[model samples]
Target: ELIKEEMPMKVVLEGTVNGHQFKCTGEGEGRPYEGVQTMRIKVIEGGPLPFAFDILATSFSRTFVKHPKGIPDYFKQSFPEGFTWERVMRFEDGGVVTVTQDTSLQDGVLIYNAKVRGVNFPSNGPVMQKKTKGWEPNTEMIYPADGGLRGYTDMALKVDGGGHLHCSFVTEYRSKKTVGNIKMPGVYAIDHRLERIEESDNETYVVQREVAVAKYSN
Candidate 1:
């Protein structure tokens, strides 16, 4: 049986140069169909530099939506333009800068439109993604006891201007309790072998670490 559920939610993003109060009154119940595992910028340290530590966290969100052209209706827009969000940030080093983020599902590819130091930066969207065949009834989001997942992300930077970064950072993570079966945190996962490469006008540097996973809500 296809279950239907709705929970009232609101996401407000505030800033100095650019600010938007999104009721998400609608974005709240984004009836997701295939449900997807997406990653958000956890944190960005060092800017427009060679080796910046850009932390990331993976999250799985499910929304059963109503659509006609395969893709969700909310994801579509008028021709020549995609779903774009623009903002201006106040930075001490860079003053106020404009940042525009656009995501479109045209040309059969997901796009992450961004900028770095007033320059267009190459985006890392997705490849080998097959959603056209249709979505299956899969809503799996849990850490298995005996195993976990593995993936990789290329380090890069993109910004519109002086801005604020929102994400969770921690010195330590995961459940320290385990007795051959039970994990104190109940379940846990992480990004394995995550490495950050830093470089500049002269030398290069590489830092490797794993971002621990403790829990999920959505």
Candidate 2:
């Protein structure tokens, strides 16, 4: 006989940068501007579990004024060799996702691929805003939460079937010292379970467990 059921579990995913617990979600985009791609997965608990995975890709195109002396040319040089220099600014593209079936469910895994592109000056310098947009300078822009220069796109997983889960991703980062101080790569890993609180209204409230930091690299 087939039984319909919902079990309790916990889930968590931590984010780090250069071996530091930078944030709970992950690092944002940075620089003159670009595009991004992300892969996310949500898994259920118990037998015959259900889950959701998505591969999201976004891009941006705009124009900006060039730095006075072009003190830092690394940003412009990082792009394709034939990139044009018109009104400066930034541009980018890329995001894809793929999945594999797990017969045992106890050792299931999910893989993903993400890429970014754009042009900016000063290397790791903060992102500049358009004077006319009159928008508040947001640090999140530097984090690429909305597709900036420095973002992350790495492989993640839902391990141990419905027992536990694991997530991992990579970042193309820049340092603060120099124009092309791009180094100190980091990784994010966490452990946790998921729990179902109620089911009377056909809706569920899931309690996300605390995120744990794994090994980080610089």
Candidate 3:
């Protein structure tokens, strides 16, 4: 089956910002396909340089089951790949951000090449987003009693000086325990709802949050 995984991982992220809250944990690995994750946000109550922060990231992902051209032919031999995701975050204050998504299939829709890059004050360097259609036509569905490959992410950002950030997410990759049906190592959960707003000239700052992340690997 060509599945011999590798990694030393464990990731956790709890949420809330404008509402005040936080919880973060980290320990990561992955080299077979590129990976590195780290987190640190533990305020739980409030107050902390704009809202508890700290994260080191470098991750790449890809998943597909349909929407690449509409598989259906016996799931096209278990999908030939379609959706793609990337994250590059290094912010403890040093900033550095980059988020991406790439998927294409014109006539049948399902085209998304969304992106975000950064420089100073929360980006303010480069920002780009274009081509979006059929946002989440299924996101690789699988609910083996509770989870298995799920995805959803809504984004909006504009910072660097003035600010505005919005993110809505839900991602769940599953595998509690299974040795027979070719399933064993797995665990990833991300459920976040975030909002950030900044207005200068006097005063105005808001950062909202609702995060819940859990990832494990070994």
Per-residue alpha-carbon lDDT of model 3 for 70-162, expressed as tens digits?
A: 221111121123334445444333445555545333332223343444444332322212111111211122222232344444443444444
- Candidate 3, clashing residue pairs? 15-211, 18-207, 18-208
Write one digit per residue (lDDT tens) for candidate 1, span 121-206: 11221101110111111122232323211112221222234232222221111122222332222222222222232323322122
- So what's the TM-score on candidate 2? 0.18
Off by over 4 Å in 2: 1-168, 173-204, 214-218
Worst 10 residues of 2 by lDDT: 56-65
lDDT of each: 0.24, 0.20, 0.30
Candidate topping TM-score: 1
Give the runs in model 1 whose Cα sits over 4 Å from its true position: 1-36, 39-81, 91-97, 118-218
- What is the total number of backbone clashes in candidate 2? 12
